[PDB]
Design a protein around this ligand. Structure first.
Ligand SMILES: CC[C@H](C)NC(=O)c1ccccc1C[N@@H+](C)Cc1ccc2c(c1C(=O)O)OCO2
Ligand SMILES: CC[C@H](C)NC(=O)c1ccccc1C[N@@H+](C)Cc1ccc2c(c1C(=O)O)OCO2
Ligand SMILES: [Cl-]
Lengths: 149, 149
C-alpha cells in the first residue's frame, strides 16, 4: 500500500500532463510533456522513484505497459510495472475526478504564469497542501514513516 | 529544521546541475539546466515546495537571492528565502563533499544513459536510497512525520 502509485495522462492547451498519484494518500506529482512517449514516461518514473519509495506502478495504458524504454526504467529503479486495469470499478471515477479537480486549480492559477508547466506546478502545490484533518502531503509522509517503523 | 533546504549549483559536461538538499537528512532533489537563471531557480523551487513542506531555502548565491523571479516564486510558495552564508563554516565542506559524491555516482551510471539529465536522476536515486542505519529518503520522511505529529 505505501509503495503503490497510479499513472494518469490528461490533456490541456494541446499539451500532455503526466500525473503520478500515490493511491493511499491522493498525493501527486505531475509534469507537462509535448506528448506521451515511452521515453518521457520512463524519465518521469525514474524521477519519481528517486524521490519516493515507489514499489508498484499501475501504468496508464498498454503502450506504456509494453514500452521497452518504460520496462528498462522500471527494472533500473526496482519498480514492479502492473496494468492500470480498474478491477475495482471505483478507480475510473477517482482518476476522472482528480483530472477534473486539477484542471480547475490550473484554471484558478492560469493567469499567474505564462507557461502551462508553471501553472501545473502551482496546481500540484495547491492539491498536495489542501486539508481535506490532513493534507495529501501529510498523509503520504505518515503512511511511509509508519511503513519504515 | 524539518522545513530547511539549501540550494547548491554544480557543473558537469558544460551544463549546470541545480541541487536542493534537505539539511537535516541529506536527501536531495536535482535537475539539469543549461544555465542558472532566476527563472530556472524559481521554477525548481516551485516544484520542490509542491512536493515537500519547504519553509526556508538558503539560496546558493546573491544573484538568486536578489532575483525578482526567485522572490516572486518564494512568495507564491510560502518560502522564506535566506542567504546561504556558512556562518557555521562546516556548511561549505558538506556541500563540496556532496557535489564530489554526486559526481562520482554520475560517472558510475554515466554509461547507462545518453543524456546527462538521466544520469543525474539515477544518481539522485542512488544517493537517496543509500543506507548509511537509515537512508536519506527514510530520514526525511521520519523527520517530517514527527513534525506533523
Ligand atoms: C519573462 C516573462 C515571464 C514569462 N513572465 C510572465 O509572463 C508572467 C505572467 C504572469 C505571472 C507571472 C509571470 C512571471 N513568470 C516569469 C513566472 C514564471 C517563473 C518561472 C518560470 C516560468 C514562469 C512563467 O511565467 O510561466 O515558466 C517556467 O519557469
Ligand atoms: C533506465 C536507463 C536504461 C537502463 N538505460 C538505457 O536503456 C540506455 C543506456 C545507454 C544509452 C541509451 C539508453 C536508452 N535510453 C533511452 C535511456 C533513457 C530513458 C529515458 C530518457 C532518457 C534516456 C537516455 O538515454 O538518456 O533521456 C530522457 O528520458
Ligand atoms: Cl510565480
Amino acid at each position: 500500500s505505501p509503495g503503490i502509485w497510479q499513472l494518469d495522462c490528461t490533456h490541456l492547451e494541446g499539451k500532455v500532463i503526466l500525473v503520478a498519484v500515490h493511491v493511499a494518500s491522493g498525493y501527486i506529482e505531475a509534469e507537462v510533456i509535448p506528448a506521451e512517449t515511452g521515453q518521457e514516461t520512463a524519465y518521469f518514473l525514474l524521477k519519481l522513484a528517486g524521490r519516493w519509495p515507489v514499489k508498484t506502478v499501475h501504468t496508464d495504458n498498454g503502450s506504456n505497459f509494453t514500452s521497452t524504454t518504460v520496462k528498462a526504467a522500471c527494472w533500473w529503479a526496482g519498480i514492479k510495472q502492473e496494468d492500470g486495469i480498474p478491477y475495482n470499478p471505483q478507480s475510473q471515477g477517482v482518476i476522472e475526478s482528480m483530472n477534473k479537480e486539477l484542471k480547475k486549480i490550473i484554471g484558478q492559477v492560469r493567469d499567474q504564469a505564462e507557461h502551462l508547466k508553471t501553472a501545473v506546478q502551482m496546481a500540484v502545490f495547491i492539491h498536495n497542501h489542501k486539508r481535506k484533518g490532513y493534507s495529501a502531503g501529510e498523509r503520504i509522509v505518515d503512511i511511509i514513516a509508519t511503513d519504515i517503523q
